[PDB]
Design a protein around this ligand. Structure first.
Ligand SMILES: c1cnc2cc3c(cc2n1)[C@@H]1CNC[C@H]3C1
Length: 509
């Protein structure tokens, strides 16, 4: 029982950090340590550590906060990605909601959305951006009716202020606006009505609403109706205020049509008119749900009364969100960060960048048709990589070829490929005369690495927390770059560099 399991993915950095963790545990404790190295897969560690060292899994492994968000929250999907549809003079939007269940499961809700101005006046057709939403569901203790108290914060992002620059409907949201919401719905023949009253502050992006089921008991769980039940109250920062389509349609309003597909269950089809009446912003919705299962998760009320927390783009917020959602669900402890952010970045030959005056990803996308992308498997398959990039940046590459790590640097050196997915810790970025490009639309989450341990393993031997926090903020990105290079440039074995570093900083000896 004295032994423990430490897992790792198969890439240069992960093996090194796993050997570092093992050396720490064997030095500052008298514990036996195993070094498991799982390969391939899709989010493999997560499953291995869900199993544990007893079920031939893992107990401790190093994870990055962005991939953690992808694990627990499915990072790119909860963001409401908005693009412009010039045909219908409006906008289109895509996202997914992950409804928690009692048995740790997740019910998927795929949202496709169209918005079309009701009036015939001019409206703002925006560039690709996204809405980040935080939703808090609660109850009134004194309300005997079936209800939901909802409090929302919506902020727009995905557009940069480049220190180079400076509507009629917006003037209607300067103060606090009353909000009426009326939803007439039918799901599998169940007819119901929901009436919600509240207020909205668009300058802060805050919504405070109370919804009541005026027809008795609601035949569906409340969180499935949260998206359906006022995107004009989103806080748009000044530097992208000319991209708020919703406020520009006011006071005439807009039609919001939505198709919500529940995985392995029925679907909602909703049409709403969001418009001003007197001084009140009203949202009138007709909802028709069909093909639902009577004992399913929706018609069986198998969804918890909560909402997944928002996947933040701020490093501190990202770390804390991932730590909280790992501890709450699946009972997994995030330890202190090692102090280096190994993020994806689209790097080019700096000669090419000088030739085409490429500074940011947006500059790269406008000429992406002439270029070839050589990316790793994890960047072409992971939703936090190229597929998630494309729903914000509109990259149109001529070719995309998955390549083993290290092959991509020697391939961009010989112009077999123009753009590669360089990881910031690869020491090869300086030695190949390359250039990282600015992720101006801020799609990528923070990828600060930190170790991860199970709670029961932390309980059987309680000293592991302190012995693994010896590495907290000890490895800078440039330090890790030198060591990664020692493994990738020179032929040195991974464990040797780990022992050397821990001797150098006075940890292993
Ligand atoms: C799936 C699971 N974990 C990953 C960790 C990393 C990557 C891709 C992954 N894909 C690289 C990008 N950021 C941290 C490293 C390296």
């Amino acid at each position: 029982n004295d032994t423990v399991v430490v897992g790792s993915i198969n890439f240069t950095e992960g093996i090194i950090v796993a050997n570092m963790v093992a050396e720490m545990i064997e030095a500052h404790t008298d514990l036996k340590v195993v070094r498991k190295l799982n390969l391939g897969g899709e989010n493999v560690n997560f499953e291995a550590i869900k199993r544990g060292g007893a079920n031939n899994g893992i107990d401790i492994y190093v994870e990055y906060t962005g991939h953690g968000l992808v694990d627990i929250l499915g990072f790119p999907e909860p963001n409401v990605y908005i693009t412009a549809d010039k045909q219908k003079n409006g906008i289109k939007a895509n996202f997914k909601i992950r409804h928690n269940m009692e048995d740790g499961s997740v019910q998927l809700a795929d949202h496709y959305q169209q918005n079309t101005p009701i009036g015939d006046g001019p409206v703002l057709l925006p560039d690709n951006h996204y809405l980040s939403t935080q939703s808090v569901l609660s109850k009134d203790p004194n309300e005997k009716r079936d209800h939901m108290v909802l409090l929302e914060f919506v902020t727009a992002a995905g557009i940069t202020l480049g220190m180079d620059e400076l509507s009629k409907g917006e003037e209607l949201f300067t103060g606090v606006v009353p909000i009426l919401v009326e939803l007439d719905g039918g799901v599998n023949g169940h007819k119901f009505s929901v009436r919600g009253e509240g207020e909205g502050d668009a300058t802060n992006g805050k919504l405070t609403l109370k919804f009541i089921c005026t027809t008795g008991k609601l035949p569906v769980p409340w969180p499935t109706l949260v998206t359906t039940l006022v995107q004009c109250f989103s806080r748009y920062p000044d530097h992208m205020k000319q991209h708020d389509f919703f406020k520009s349609a006011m006071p005439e309003g807009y039609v919001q049509e939505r198709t919500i597909s529940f995985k392995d269950d029925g679907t909602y089809k909703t049409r709403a008119e969001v418009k001003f009446e007197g001084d009140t912003l009203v949202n009138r919705i007709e909802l028709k749900g069909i093909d639902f299962k009577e004992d399913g998760n929706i018609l069986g009320h198998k969804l918890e009364y909560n909402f997944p927390p928002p996947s933040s783009t701020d490093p501190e917020g990202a770390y804390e969100t991932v730590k909280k959602e790992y501890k709450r669900k699946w009972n997994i402890v995030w330890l202190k960060p090692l102090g280096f952010n190994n993020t994806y970045t689209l790097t080019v030959k700096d000669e090419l960048a000088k030739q085409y005056n490429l500074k940011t990803f947006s500059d790269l996308a406008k000429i992406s048709d002439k270029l070839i992308l050589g990316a790793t498997m994890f960047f072409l398959e992971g939703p936090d990589g190229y597929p998630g990039l494309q729903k914000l940046y509109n990259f149109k590459f001529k070719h995309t070829k998955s390549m083993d790590m290290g092959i991509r640097y020697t391939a961009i050196d010989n112009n077999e490929v123009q753009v590669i997915d360089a990881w910031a810790t690869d020491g090869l970025l300086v030695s190949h005369k390359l250039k990282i490009l600015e992720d101006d639309k801020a799609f990528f989450p923070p990828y600060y690495a930190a170790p991860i341990i199970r709670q029961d393993v932390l309980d059987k031997h309680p000293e592991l927390k302190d012995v693994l926090n010896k590495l907290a903020n000890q490895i800078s990105l440039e330090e890790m770059q030198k060591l990664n290079y020692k493994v990738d440039g020179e032929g040195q074995d991974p464990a040797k560099v780990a022992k050397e570093f821990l001797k150098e900083k006075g940890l292993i000896l």
